[PDB]
Enzyme design. Structure first.
Site, short mmCIF file in Angstrom:
data_model
loop_
_atom_site.label_atom_id
_atom_site.label_comp_id
_atom_site.label_asym_id
_atom_site.label_seq_id
_atom_site.Cartn_x
_atom_site.Cartn_y
_atom_site.Cartn_z
N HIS A 10 0.82 -1.23 0.00
CA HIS A 10 0.00 0.00 0.00
C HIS A 10 0.84 1.27 0.00
CE1 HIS A 10 -3.17 -2.82 0.86
NE2 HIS A 10 -2.62 -3.14 2.01
N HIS A 43 5.11 6.93 6.68
CA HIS A 43 4.92 6.49 5.30
C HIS A 43 4.48 7.71 4.49
CE1 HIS A 43 0.92 6.26 7.21
NE2 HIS A 43 0.51 6.70 6.03
N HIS A 84 2.02 9.02 0.83
CA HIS A 84 1.07 8.77 -0.26
C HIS A 84 1.49 9.70 -1.38
CE1 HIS A 84 -1.72 6.88 2.67
NE2 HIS A 84 -1.11 7.73 3.48
N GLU A 126 -3.36 13.50 0.25
CA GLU A 126 -4.65 13.06 0.70
C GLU A 126 -5.44 14.26 1.18
OE1 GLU A 126 -3.81 9.54 3.34
OE2 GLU A 126 -4.58 8.59 1.51
N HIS A 133 3.09 11.07 6.34
CA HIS A 133 2.36 10.83 7.58
C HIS A 133 3.31 10.23 8.61
CE1 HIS A 133 -1.68 10.59 5.19
NE2 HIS A 133 -1.34 11.83 5.48
N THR A 165 -6.59 7.01 7.03
CA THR A 165 -7.02 7.18 5.63
C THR A 165 -6.99 5.87 4.82
OG1 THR A 165 -4.81 7.71 4.84
CG2 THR A 165 -6.18 9.57 5.63
N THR A 166 -6.56 4.79 5.46
CA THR A 166 -6.67 3.44 4.86
C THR A 166 -7.53 2.55 5.74
OG1 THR A 166 -4.80 2.26 5.94
CG2 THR A 166 -4.25 3.62 4.01
#
Ligand SMILES: N#Cc1ccc(Cn2cncn2)cc1-c1ccc(OS(N)(=O)=O)c(Cl)c1
Ligand SMILES: N#Cc1ccc(Cn2cncn2)cc1-c1ccc(OS(N)(=O)=O)c(Cl)c1
Ligand SMILES: [Zn+2]
Length: 257
Positions: A61, A91, A93, A103, A116, A195-196
Site C-alpha cells: 500500500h 509512510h 502517499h 490526501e 504521515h 485514511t486506509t
C-alpha cells in the site's frame, strides 16, 4: 483485498469497512478561509532527537519506515494534544503525476505527495489499544511539492530499490526523521481517521501549513515501487491516496493567524 484500483479502491472500501461513510473520516479539504485560528492551542512539540529507526518495508500500500517505540525516544506533544504520543512509523502517499498524490487538500489544491508520521497515545500502552480510542493516534501530515531536493529524504529514496515489491523489507537504522520537517510548525488540526482500512476514527490530525520540497528525481523513485508481489505483472505503486471526505460536523482549527 482492498487497494487503490478501479475494483478495490476508495469507492469500494465501505463494503468491508462500513466506517468509510462515518462521521469523522479523513482526509478532508482544508478550506483556509473557514478554518478558525485558535489562540488556546499550546505550541507543538516535536521531539525526535532520540528516534531509533529499525526497518523499511513495502506492505503493498505504501512504504513504511518503522521505529523502535519501546521507550519514549521520539514523541509528539503540545498543540491540540493531551499527554504524550510516541512515533511508531512514517509512510507517504503520492501520485502518478506532480498535480496529485496528497490526501489532504488545501483550498482544493492537491500536492505531489503527503508524509504521515504516525504516533500513538502512551496512555493506552500500545498501538492496537490506541486505535480503539477517539484520541488514540496523532498523525503529523506534511505536504510534498516538487522543486529542490530534500537532502534528508535521499537516504530513504536510495533504499527503495531494495523493497520494490509487496512484502519486501530492509534494515533501515540511524535515519533521522528531523530531516523531513519544514521550517515552520504552523498547522491546522481536526479530529479524523486512518485514511486506509480499517479507517478507524481515532486520529487527531495535525497538518503542517508549510510543504517540504522534494526533487523530481526523488518522487520519480517513489513511483518505481510496485503494488504487486515479486514475480507478478508489474503494477506501479502510484496514486495510493484516498480523496477528500465529507467534513460533516467538524471545525478545522488553525494554530496561526
Ligand atoms: N497494526 C498494528 C499494531 C497493533 C499493535 C501494536 C502493538 N504495539 C507495539 N508497539 C506499540 N504498540 C502495534 C501495531 C503496529 C505495528 C507497526 C506499525 O507500523 C503500526 Cl502503524 C502499528
Ligand atoms: N493501522 C495501521 C498500520 C499498521 C502497520 C503499518 C505499517 N506496516 C508495518 N508492517 C506492515 N505494515 C501502517 C499502518 C497504518 C497505515 C495507515 C494509517 O493511516 S494514516 N494514512 O492516516 O496515516 C495508519 Cl494511522 C497506520
Ligand atoms: Zn497515511
Amino acid at each position: 483485498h482492498w487497494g487503490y484500483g478501479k475494483h478495490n479502491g476508495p469507492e469500494h472500501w465501505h463494503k468491508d469497512f462500513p466506517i468509510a461513510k462515518g462521521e469523522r473520516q479523513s482526509p478532508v479539504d482544508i478550506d483556509t478561509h473557514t478554518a478558525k485560528y485558535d489562540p488556546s492551542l499550546k505550541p507543538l512539540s516535536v521531539s525526535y532527537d532520540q528516534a531509533t529507526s529499525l526497518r523499511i518495508l513495502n506492505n503493498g500500500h505504501a512504504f513504511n519506515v518503522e521505529f523502535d517505540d519501546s521507550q519514549d525516544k521520539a514523541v509528539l506533544k503540545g498543540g491540540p494534544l493531551d499527554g504524550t504520543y510516541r512515533l511508531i512509523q512514517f509512510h507517504f502517499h503520492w501520485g502518478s503525476l506532480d498535480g496529485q498524490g496528497s490526501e489532504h487538500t488545501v483550498d482544493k489544491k492537491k500536492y505531489a505527495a503527503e508524509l504521515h508520521l504516525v504516533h500513538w497515545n502512551t496512555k493506552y500502552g500500545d498501538f492496537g489499544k490506541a486505535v480503539q480510542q477517539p484520541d488514540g493516534l496523532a498523525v503529523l501530515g506534511i505536504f510534498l511539492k516538487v522543486g529542490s531536493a530534500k537532502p534528508g529524504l535521499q537516504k530513504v529514496v536510495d533504499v527503495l530499490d531494495s523493497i520494490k515489491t509487496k512484502g519486501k523489507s530492509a534494515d533501515f537504522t540511524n535515519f533521522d526523521p528531523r530531516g523531513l520537517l519544514p521550517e515552520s510548525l504552523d498547522y491546522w488540526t481536526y479530529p479524523g481517521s486512518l485514511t486506509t482500512p480499517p479507517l478507524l476514527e481515532c486520529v487527531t490530525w495535525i497538518v503542517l501549513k508549510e510543504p517540504i520540497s522534494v526533487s523530481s528525481e526523488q518522487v520519480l523513485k517513489f513511483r518505481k515501487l510496485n503494488f504487486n508481489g515479486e514475480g507478478e505483472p508489474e503494477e506501479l505503486m502510484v496514486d495510493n491516496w484516498r480523496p477528500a471526505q465529507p467534513l460533516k460536523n467538524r471545525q478545522i482549527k488553525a494554530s496561526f493567524k
